[PDB]
Amino acid sequence: WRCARSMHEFSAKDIDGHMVNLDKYRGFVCIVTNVASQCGKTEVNYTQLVDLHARYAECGLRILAFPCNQFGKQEPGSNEEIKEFAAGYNVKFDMFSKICVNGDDAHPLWKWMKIQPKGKGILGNAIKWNFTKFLIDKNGCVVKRYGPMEEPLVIEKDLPHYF
Closest CA to 48 of 131, 134, 136, 137: 131
Site for ligand L8X in 7-36 (CB under 6 A): none
Least distance in Å: CB of 160 to ligand L8X? 4
Q: Is 28 helix (H, G, I), strand (E, B) or coil?
A: coil
Residues 6 or more apart whose Cβ sits within 8 Å of residue 21: 11
Nearer to ligand L8X, 40 or 160 (CB): 160
Cα separation, 84 vs 7, in Å, equals 27
Nearer to ligand L8X, 21 or 163 (CB): 163
54 binds ligand L8X (CB under 6 A): no
Kindly give the pairing relationship between strand 19-21 and strand 61-67. unpaired
- Residue 65 dihedral angles phi and psi, to the nearest 5°: -110, 120
Least distance in Å: CB of 163 to ligand L8X? 4
Kindly give the pairing relationship between strand 19-21 and strand 11-13. antiparallel
Nearer to ligand L8X, 59 or 149 (CB): 59
Cα separation, 5 vs 27, in Å, equals 15
Is 135:1 a contact under the CB 8 Å cutoff?
no
Least distance in Å: CB of 105 to ligand L8X? 38
59 binds ligand L8X (CB under 6 A): yes
163 binds ligand L8X (CB under 6 A): yes
List 27, 72, 103, 160, residue binding ligand L8X (CB under 6 A)? 160
Using CB positions, name the residue nearest to ligand L8X: 59
Least distance in Å: CB of 161 to ligand L8X? 8
> Which residues are near ligand L8X by CB under 6 A?
58-59, 160, 163
